[model samples]
Target: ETVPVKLKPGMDGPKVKQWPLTEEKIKALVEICTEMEKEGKISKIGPENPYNTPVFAIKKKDSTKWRKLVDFRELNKRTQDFWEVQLGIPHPAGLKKKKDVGDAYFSVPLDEDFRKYTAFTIPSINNETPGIRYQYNVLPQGWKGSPAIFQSSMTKILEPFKKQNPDIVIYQYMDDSDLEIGQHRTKIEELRQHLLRWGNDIQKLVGKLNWASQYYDPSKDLIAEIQKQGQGQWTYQIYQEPFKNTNDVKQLTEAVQKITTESIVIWGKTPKFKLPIQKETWETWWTEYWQATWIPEW
Candidate 1:
């Protein structure tokens, strides 16, 4: 019999590690944040930095914290709310009975105030239970505000590329840019051929992705490409649709429990959050436990 291999990522993966922002990264990250600050994006800087920006290391349970640079939110007390949001996350339009908010990840509202801060909070995308949340301190490009700066910055960065490949389709979701192309394997190889042509330009593009997330998606594909020079692939997914359901809220609560069990099978550790600290036999009757905390950035 084939022993089951848990291929999914969660706690099974290495505990996420973080490092304090190096003087260089902090300077660069803060430079962008500072620019956003001047642009009235952020209100304050963290670690009261001349030295470091206070950051957190989100690792497996019972692990030590690593130093990483992040613009601390203590500064939020000074910033203004920039954006307004009604649809917190993806959802089908129209009035519905009730919502299993878990069906959709609450979207960080886009706002001028959002521009004020370089970061916001999101759950560990892996969080399976209700009320689980974590700070998504968006690095320069890591958070939702990337779109805020993309237009202005792209004008400068994409200038030459636009001149050469005016047809290059570029659209963004959070910090990810959709570089529309026909083929993955061929295109990646094509990119290699033209390395001399667009090497520096592509580096900037990679930077954009990093500012969004720490290169998780890119690293996956890059590994594939490196292993097999030619037959490599690129992913072209664009968007995820929304949903609606009245009972979905409660049903989803239970569904998430099942989901978490599987998540453990794949991830190797139970997720932590607002859920029962340990598994519990459900009470005779059920009460919805969204347990989600909705704090307005005020």
Candidate 2:
């Protein structure tokens, strides 16, 4: 069954200007749209449609491939909020298995009437040709209410299984169910890999190092140095040029490599401590000084 999107009264969809993209990005966009159409995720629509939103392509984290996503902020503002699903799962004492729903959002279909509101235009690389418009046949990513709708649907579908096997406790938190000292080692390893051939993207290196800030003490200063070089603008090519050989980068690289995880402590519950102040004294102070009192106005 398809999920229907509800809009606020008298509200119309937004028409936003498309962001400028390089020729390479344009090609990537075209390829993705064609693939998605074949997969029945999206289909071309008439140009006369009233609603239009911008779409952009983002580079996938580990690969050179691009992921196309719609800018649904404006449309989401006018759409009504969907109910949220909450499920509590206590820490498992036995064997646990993790599974992710492939194409989670796309698995849920959108209402026919609401498809037009998700329309996006693809401008021709050559300005002379007319642009094409398309709408999602499935639930589009980046819509604020998509999580709630998907969660509700998934819960109902799994309800039977849950009822049949009362002994099996299923904990569902949105799509996939759920890290720290092993976190330090993992982040360090990831940072080392990224630093080896981070390409021309200074922001990528900065983000990788930033992830270690909480547990890795040296990352704070190193991140600051990298940020100083970027001068608030993260993607400037001129700023990125010097980053490869910069002392800060070299120091961070050397630090991660030299650091050993042998002494790293595993995350666990905080140690119990005896209270410094007696409970009787705490109660007396709360009654005497912490309590609110009514005073006459001057």
Candidate 3:
């Protein structure tokens, strides 16, 4: 089933706008748009459409390819909010399978009536020919209600599978589907790998460990060491270095190893164990962490 865009009362169309891009960005945008059109995600339209928005190309992280993104700020402000409540995923001590839906928003077709508002003008390569207009045939990224809408659609789509296979615990967060198939030590090993990768940032490392700490009990020394190091820096400022010194890293590594090998796993209900750090410390850390991670305070 397809989801339709809903606009607030008196919202006629998006603000007419275009973004000035460099020659390189323009070339990339043209290529990306051509590919999108080929995929039936967007289509060329006439210049008669009044609703227009800016489109720009952004380089993918750690990659050479460009990702075309639309600025839907004006339209989002006029669109009615969808059900945006997000529940936390269950932290069961079990083997997990992660699946990502490719071009998730684009997979959901937009309503024909609302496609006009998603139009944008693509400038000619030489700037000599008149700019061509295009409109999205499917739900475009950067739309405010897209995540919620997509999540709702996925939930509906998976309802049958969920009813048939009652044992498979599926947890969906927008486009990411996490399936909990069924381990304690293995789970800790997975957490250890994540810790190694994310250990550059003390807050990130501790936050992940804290989440795992709900099901698995880590060493008190690890928690104590993390607290000692975390308190040294201001929670409001972003960290530039992973750790203060090699000694800290060495000690933390030992602590991590100790927890990985010796930590106990709590079954049934969640444990009431709290990290041996000050309440205000992590509270402020969490507040600044959320803000730094681009989670808007609403």
Candidate 4:
């Protein structure tokens, strides 16, 4: 079944033309095009009334392989409001099982004439002029509304199965969980260790120690000391025992490692990692946190 996209009034925009691939990517491009063409996912088109967009490939981080990525920014922007609907990212809190529909966009067919707007070209294997242009028969990858459209369509496809599936929630998001959690833990530990190494002032050392209490499992007295220290700086006290125990540092370091690894298992293997930051704000926060350990003092 095919569903057409509705556009905002007078929202049409011109095509963003495709660029030539670098020599290194030529083989990969041909491999991708041939595979896609064989799958009947795309077809060659004439030059008449083209609506072209550039195609690019991005190499996966820490990997040698590249994946084709369509730059649908211009195409989606031209469609305006229809593509701007915010889809709810449902949490997996109560679900018994989670299902992920792979290659999700490819499952939803585009309505007859709407495919032209998604057209892009690749240099022909036969070395023809103007390249071999093609449009999507299915919903094109990287288009803005692809998520919402694909989600609903998949939900429809799975309606009967939903009855027996026991509240299985689905997501299109990919995972980099073990990697991300390990990195976050590294930052937290770096800060803690840096404070230990350079904070010669025992008072300041205690405060840094108190601040990082979450990273450690401590005794009742130590926990209270941490709470009492709060954001207030610690100082040498007349009536209090000093928090200069090497045991605190040892326990805290061990705790940091344990908690971070535990949290990694919770998030990567389970569904409890629900971050509530707004999508717009999430990027800014992620970038900031991604560099959280870049402390000059460290």
lDDT values, one for every candidate: 0.29, 0.49, 0.50, 0.48
Model 3's lDDT to the true fold?
0.50
lDDT of 1 by residue, 189-268 (tens): 66446544533779979976764332112112111000111233222221112211034334434444444343233322
What TM-score fits each model?
0.25, 0.49, 0.48, 0.47
Let me know the TM-score candidate 3 reaches against the reference structure: 0.48
User: Could you give candidate 2's per-residue lDDT for residues 122-201 as a string of tens digits?
Assistant: 77765857777888877766655555556665556556645754433433322321124466467557644643533137
- Candidate 1 TM-score, C-alpha based: 0.25
Where is model 4 poorest over a 10-residue stretch in terms of lDDT? 289-298
Please report, as a residue range, the 10-residue window in candidate 3 with the lowest summed lDDT: 288-297
Q: 29-138, model 4: which lDDT tens digit per residue?
A: 66787798899888877767558776665554536655566666676656635644445433344332222233646656777656777787765434555476777877
Best by lDDT: 3
lDDT per residue (tens digit) for residues 154-220 in model 3: 5565565457644444333223224342353554466457445433588978886664433233322
Best by TM-score: 2
The deviation in Å at residue 237 for candidate 4 is 40
- The stretch of ten residues in a row with the least summed lDDT in candidate 1 is 219-228
Q: Show model 4 residue runs off by greater than 4 Å.
A: 61-64, 84-102, 123-128, 153-298
In terms of lDDT, the poorest run of 10 residues in model 2 is 289-298
lDDT of 3 at 95: 25
